[PDB]
Amino acid sequence: AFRVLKPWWDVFTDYLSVAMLMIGVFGCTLQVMQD
Amino acid sequence: AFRVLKPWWDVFTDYLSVAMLMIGVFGCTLQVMQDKIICLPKRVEMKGLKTDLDLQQYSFINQMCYERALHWYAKYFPYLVLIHTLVFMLCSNFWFKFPGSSSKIEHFISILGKCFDSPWTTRALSEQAKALFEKVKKFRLHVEEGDILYAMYVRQTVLKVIKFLIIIAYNSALVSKVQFTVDCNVDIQDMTGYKNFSCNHTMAHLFSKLSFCYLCFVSIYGLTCLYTLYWLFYRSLREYSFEYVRQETGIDDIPDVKNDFAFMLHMIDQYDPLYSKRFAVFLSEVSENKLKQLNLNNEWTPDKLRQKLQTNAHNRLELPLIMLSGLPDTVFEITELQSLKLEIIKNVMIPATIAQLDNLQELCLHQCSVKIHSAALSFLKENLKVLSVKFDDMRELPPWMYGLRNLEELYLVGSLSHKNVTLESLRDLKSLKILSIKSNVSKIPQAVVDVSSHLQKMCVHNDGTKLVMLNNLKKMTNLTELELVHCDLERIPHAVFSLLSLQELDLKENNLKSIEEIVSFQHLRKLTVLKLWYNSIAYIPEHIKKLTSLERLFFSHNKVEVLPSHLFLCNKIRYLDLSYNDIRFIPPEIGVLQSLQYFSITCNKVESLPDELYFCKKLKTLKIGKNSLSVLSPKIGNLLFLSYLDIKGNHFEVLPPELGDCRALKRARLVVEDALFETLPSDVREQMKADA
Description:
part of a larger assembly, mainly alpha, 2 chains, 1 helix, membrane protein
């Protein structure tokens, strides 16, 4: 339903998206803070 | 699932990774918070050294020299450590995060936990696990073809080792690079009026010390890998041999395991030494057999066995068995059965408990590969009297049956020639008296000669095999009853002429056409019963009158059309089978057959009945059958002892009332047309059916 529909490449893309989202949030934080 | 997969070194590596992650996060926090460079112009009673620089210039200089002079690695160290720790964690977790191997790992965890959970494992070492054996065998067949999980784990370990080596190699040189104080000569002159600056940032010494401690952790981490690497390359975990469960519990099953299975076994043993012992039980086949035995004992009750008890053909209390996987023990509790019946029961082992069933003398076996115990075999030798065996490819034949001395009657249903029969010698059968064979043997085996000293009755009913060599039958001096049914001889064999002790002769389905050997039958004065079923005989030689001892005659389903007068000279004949023949006229000489009690001419061409036939008052069975009789003589009322009459299928118009004179014949024994029976008076039919 929420797990059996994810091939390995899909899982890797999801993890890459999570990492990129974290990077973007951290970048926004630092831009607000010290830029 | 999430805990039992961690060896001690793995847990230590995880804890080191956690500590390194905490250190990296703390370093990033301090770098964001207090990592500030203070800078001053370098080259210049002591007074102050005012530089008339405003705060904006100070901050600008701090930023400029921070970008320029400060070492890149010194600035990136917290993020560097964070990245390395995250990569180590990711390469540690991808072992279970990859679904293709994660499914196998989860299946192994589930099966191991379920096997350890079963108390029947402890019972075997000392309920539903029987079906769990199927999952066990499915897993062992499917996953032993893997070993890719081991390669993946080895690759992960190699990656960790390489990362550790690189980390040490470059950090060792880079640690000495950082300094607390620093100098920067940037071209800010004529922009800020200065070029040379002395600077320092707070974290340096701390970072230095911090980095030192971090290195130590990494060092231990690397050492950990080495140990595991050595453990990977000193034991050769691709193969695992128990050699301890086999020696202690005394089980020779569970020989070895494949690369993947040995790897998982080693991992579990390092995690827990007793989990492997508990999990190995369901690999054993003997354990599976015993668990099936327990389940069968739960399924079977003595009540079920006694309900299935019945009376066999040869007047014995028998327990039929049609589909079983072994011997229930409860069967040995019921000693009143005199016979046992087995049908399609392979892999049967008879223990000494068969000695409990004292009152056993017969056994029936239908397609069963059975072996006995020593006490079981001795009990069978000393107690069995009758035995019936059915086998298809000689594999169900138990050889020890040839060693049973007290056996009396034996029945064999199975081909032996498939032309020499692979029959074992019948020497130990010291009390064999009756033999029955259902095979395709072309020549009589020599083994029977080893039993002819006490053999009394040999029955061989082949499916049509021609008995070319009958020389051994001449050795049957003690044979009193002989049957050669469907032996395809087509002539009376010369060997039977050597059997003076013979009493009853049967030649069914031999298709005898010329029988001019009846004179030789005069050499045998004990011939009371002679049988010629399903032969091509059309004429009866006069020599048959010379058989003094004849008591029964058989000519059913033959080509005899007009029967000779001299055939009636054997006044001692009591059974006369003339049905299914071309018999048309019954000669009056049948009146001299006073001793006759049987006469069947069913499915013949008989058109009239002589009155002399009714002089044979001893006739208790008369089977006219399907003939062409138009009227029945009233003299049938004189046959006071006639018990069966079969005239249905004839041309009778009205049955005579004299049928009421038949004391031994009733409605059930009277086979007549319903209209013919209706032609009888009301009193006659009332007397036949009931007692008025």
